[PDB]
Symmetry: none
Subunit: 132 residues, 2 copies
């Protein structure tokens, strides 16, 4: 794994925590771009191993209790009677409300390492992942 990046055990994933300070917390979208501009992406957690890895990273750094953006994101219309949407007559720019808010998953940096979904525009620390 790259320049000081949490080395997974059974996955080619390397994780790195980014929590340099409050004033430098980014949104989920900024966080994703940031990680992508590094040849990676926001961290995905697919097993307990990857989780302990991030937790060790949190311990070694002493980032206890801080929240982090993980690559978790959520994301058309249907007829109630089951019929298929074979026809549409939406007004200009419609539908659009179902996109005024988006939700993303953040990691709670304590022993539970639990996830919570919140507005993707909130300011958070984040965790990147980049292939070995």
């Amino acid at each position: 794994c790259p320049e000081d990046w949490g080395a997974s055990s059974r996955t080619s994933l390397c994780f790195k925590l980014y929590a340099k300070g409050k004033h430098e917390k980014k949104t989920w979208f900024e966080s994703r771009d940031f990680c992508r501009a590094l040849g990676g992406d926001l961290a995905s957690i697919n097993n307990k191993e990857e989780q302990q890895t991030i937790w060790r990273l949190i311990t070694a750094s002493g980032s206890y209790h801080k929240l982090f953006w993980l690559g978790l994101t959520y994301g058309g219309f249907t007829w109630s009677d089951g019929s298929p949407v074979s026809y549409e007559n939406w007004a200009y720019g419609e539908p659009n409300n179902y996109q005024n808010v988006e939700y993303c998953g953040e990691l709670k940096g304590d022993p539970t390492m639990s996830w919570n979904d919140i507005n993707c525009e909130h300011l958070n620390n984040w965790i990147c992942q980049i292939q070995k």
Copy 2:
């Protein structure tokens, strides 16, 4: 397939991408500061390894009307350890330097600059001088 970032002059047949930095006279830098600037982005001071790469830079100069300006290039004099000779110029065969010697010769003093005119000619000058500069980045990479 590797490509160049947010509009950085791309060298068609090579892997280098170039970008001019001439924010004006009061924003100029020294070779080292320039080198630190470029590396920070994830790139480096520009190297010109062939005519095609030179032409890429020249086109960048023309697109920004940056005519007659001087830019820092990655050109730097490294002081080869084989550079010592005797008074008459004869090469040094036998050697008996103290532990860690010689070492004062390694001081980095001279760097190269690009004259942004049609000639695209280079000149070595003191690295401490303030100039505009040019960075390069590997295709497939992204500024930071």
